[PDB]
């Protein structure tokens, strides 16, 4: 399952670098997807800091493993039947915001359960939608500037 593997790698790397404040070393689309995610993921968090803080408070995540409510939230987001990259990137960006807060309470927190939770909603529930547009190329091109 290359799409799942690729998606988990991109999302994990973003969440990890957001949470630690440092980048990782060592495909071409994955690199470009990550650069795009950095740019647009940082962008969504801007202007929406107050809203993200508010959502984090309501989420009331107890620890690094407490991802059930976030998964439920993400399923609910898509439950109007609409799928687009602005929603997807916002979900990933909020995941980054949450990963950051987990590191503040406990420095040795794995961001991986959160990243798996998001990748799972994305890849499992939007599988054919993603495949149709060559996966992350859809994302790269949508946000291309």
């Amino acid at each position: 399952d290359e799409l799942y593997r690729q998606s988990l790698e991109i999302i994990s790397r973003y969440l990890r670098e957001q949470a630690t404040g440092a980048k990782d070393t060592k495909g071409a689309t994955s690199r470009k997807a990550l650069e795009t995610l950095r740019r647009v993921g940082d962008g969504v968090q801007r202007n929406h800091e107050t809203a993200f803080q508010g959502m984090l408070r309501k989420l009331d995540i107890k620890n690094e493993d407490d991802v059930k409510s976030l998964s439920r939230v993400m399923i609910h987001v898509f439950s109007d039947g609409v799928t687009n990259w602005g929603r997807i990137v916002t979900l990933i960006s909020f995941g980054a915001f949450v990963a950051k807060h987990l590191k503040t309470i406990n420095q040795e927190s794995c961001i991986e359960p959160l990243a798996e939770s998001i990748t799972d909603v994305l890849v499992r529930t939007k599988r054919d939608w993603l495949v149709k547009q060559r996966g992350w190329d859809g994302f790269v091109e949508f946000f291309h500037v």
């Binding site: 647009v40 959502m55 687009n84 990137v89 979900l91």
Partner: peptide, 23 residues
């Protein structure tokens, strides 16, 4: 919900805004 409904509403709002901005 109700917290989970509110979080979802908010994420959807920002996501559609952000989609619209680039579309």
């Amino acid at each position: 919900g109700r917290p989970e409904i509110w979080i979802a509403q908010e994420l959807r709002r920002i996501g559609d805004e952000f989609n619209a901005y680039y579309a």
